Every structure is written in C-alpha cells, then in structure tokens.
Amino acid sequence: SLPDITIFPNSSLMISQGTFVTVVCSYSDKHDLYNMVRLEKDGSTFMEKSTEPYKTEDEFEIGPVNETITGHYSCIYSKGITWSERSKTLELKVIK
C-alpha cells in the first residue's frame, strides 16, 4: 500500500461553492432500533428520511452547494418522540 495521512483537528471542512457534498450518517450496533434519521443543521432539522433496512449508513447528498450550506451538522437517529441519539458535530464553510 501507499502511505496515508490524517490531520487533526478535522471537524471543520472547507467546501468550494458549487461542490456536491455527501453526508454519511452511520450507527454501528444499534441501527435497527431507530426508524428515522435526520441531518440537523445549526440546531434545526435540515433533511430527514426513514432509515435503510439493511445497511447501517444513511446518506444525504447536498449539491451544488452555496452560502446557505455553511453551518454545523450532526446526525440524529430516532424512534417516535422519546428515543434519539446524536453524532459529533462537523462544521462546513462554503467559500467563493
């Protein structure tokens, strides 16, 4: 194999205007328990859908991006009104 590189901190990403972004929400171990997944942006629901029946990843394609896409994002998995769990938060900054 070729070498790899990883840099920290990596929670804040730069994204060019007109880019297509893919957000991959994932829930190891517990995915079958939750029937909805939502992408939260800046404290409110941005996109949502039913979870995949047979994979543990749920993708949201966001593109082409503009300035409205700048913000903080997290994935929340839920069932009904009572149960929900959230991921870490990532920051996107869209640049022109």
From Swiss-Prot:
Tissue specificity as recorded in UniProt: Expressed in lymphoid organs and in cell lines of hemopoietic origin.
Domain Ig-like C2-type: residue ranges: 3-91
Subcellular location: Cell membrane
Residues in the Extracellular compartment per record: 1-96
PTM comment text: May be phosphorylated by LCK.
Residues bearing glycans: N10, N66
Disulfide bonds: C25-C75
Subunit note: Interacts with SH2 domains of tyrosine-protein phosphatases PTPN6 and PTPN11. The interaction with PTPN6 is constitutive. Interacts with the SH2 domain of CSK. Binds with high affinity to extracellular matrix collagens, the interaction is functionally important.
Function text: Functions as an inhibitory receptor that plays a constitutive negative regulatory role on cytolytic function of natural killer (NK) cells, B-cells and T-cells. Activation by Tyr phosphorylation results in recruitment and activation of the phosphatases PTPN6 and PTPN11. It also reduces the increase of intracellular calcium evoked by B-cell receptor ligation. May also play its inhibitory role independently of SH2-containing phosphatases. Modulates cytokine production in CD4+ T-cells, down-regulating IL2 and IFNG production while inducing secretion of transforming growth factor beta.
Annotated domain remarks: ITIM (immunoreceptor tyrosine-based inhibitor motif) motif is a cytoplasmic motif present in 2 copies in the intracellular part of LAIR1. When phosphorylated, ITIM motif can bind the SH2 domain of several SH2-containing phosphatases, leading to down-regulation of cell activation.
Protein name as it appears in the record: Leukocyte-associated immunoglobulin-like receptor 1
Species per Swiss-Prot/TrEMBL record: Mus musculus
Lineage of source species: Eukaryota, Metazoa, Chordata, Craniata, Vertebrata
This protein's encoding gene: Lair1
